[PDB]
Structures are given as structure tokens and as C-alpha cells.
Amino acid sequence: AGHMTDTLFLTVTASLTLPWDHIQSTLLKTKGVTDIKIYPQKRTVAVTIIPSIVNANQIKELVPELSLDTGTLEKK
């Protein structure tokens, strides 16, 4: 009935800038990520992932990224 995957808006934070291809590469490499896409806004990328099987810390380890877009919602 409900959606198989959930969408989460991430904020790109890093000392040195980099292309979306690299962002997609690291996120793609880690498990629990279905799709990564960058959108026209202030350094923001929308991603589709499964919270139940993916952890925030793993994403952070690959990329420092705040990973917290404005107006986001958290179950816990």
C-alpha cells in the first residue's frame, strides 16, 4: 500500500567541492541507496533510500555532508 522507498533531501557539505558524479558514486557504492540526483537549489541533492536498512552515519563516513535539508522530517 505504502511506498517501497522513502525520499530524503540531503545538504552537500565538504571542505573541497566535487561533482554530482562522485556524490552518486559514493552513495551508489554504499548499500541501502536506490537513486541520487542533484537539483537546482543552494547546494542540495535529493536521494531515494530505505531508512530501515541504511544508516545516516555510513553516508556521513563517505562524505562529511550535513545530510540535513531544510524542512525535513524524522520518524524518531
Curated annotation (Swiss-Prot):
Tissue/organ expression: Widely expressed including in heart, brain, lung, muscle, kidney, pancreas, and to a lesser extent placenta. Expressed in fibroblasts, aortic smooth muscle cells, aortic endothelial cells and umbilical vein endothelial cells (at protein level).
List where in the cell it is found: Golgi apparatus, trans-Golgi network membrane; Cell membrane; Melanosome membrane; Early endosome membrane
The similarity annotation says:
Belongs to the cation transport ATPase (P-type) (TC 3.A.3) family. Type IB subfamily.
Q: What is the lineage of its organism?
A: Eukaryota, Metazoa, Chordata, Craniata, Vertebrata
Q: Which residues of the full protein are shown?
A: 84 to 156 of 1500
Q: Which domain of life is it from?
A: Eukaryota
Q: Where is the signal peptide?
A: none
* Entry text on domains: The nucleotide-binding domain consists of a twisted six-stranded antiparallel beta-sheet flanked by two pairs of alpha-helices, forming a hydrophobic pocket that interacts with the adenine ring of ATP.
Q: What does this protein do?
A: ATP-driven copper (Cu(+)) ion pump that plays an important role in intracellular copper ion homeostasis. Within a catalytic cycle, acquires Cu(+) ion from donor protein on the cytoplasmic side of the membrane and delivers it to acceptor protein on the lumenal side. The transfer of Cu(+) ion across the membrane is coupled to ATP hydrolysis and is associated with a transient phosphorylation that shifts the pump conformation from inward-facing to outward-facing state.
Under which name does UniProt file this protein?
A: Copper-transporting ATPase 1
Residues carrying Phosphothreonine: T72
Gene this protein is translated from = ATP7A
Disease listed for this protein: Menkes disease: An X-linked recessive disorder of copper metabolism characterized by generalized copper deficiency. MNKD results in progressive neurodegeneration and connective-tissue disturbances: focal cerebral and cerebellar degeneration, early growth retardation, peculiar hair, hypopigmentation, cutis laxa, vascular complications and death in early childhood. The clinical features result from the dysfunction of several copper-dependent enzymes. A mild form of the disease has been described, in which cerebellar ataxia and moderate developmental delay predominate. Occipital horn syndrome: An X-linked recessive disorder of copper metabolism. Common features are unusual facial appearance, skeletal abnormalities, chronic diarrhea and genitourinary defects. The skeletal abnormalities include occipital horns, short, broad clavicles, deformed radii, ulnae and humeri, narrowing of the rib cage, undercalcified long bones with thin cortical walls and coxa valga.
Q: How the protein assembles, per its UniProt entry?
A: Monomer. Interacts with PDZD11. Interacts with ATOX1 and COMMD1. Interacts with TYRP1. Directly interacts with SOD3; this interaction is copper-dependent and is required for SOD3 activity.
What are the residue boundaries of the HMA domain, all occurrences included? 5-71
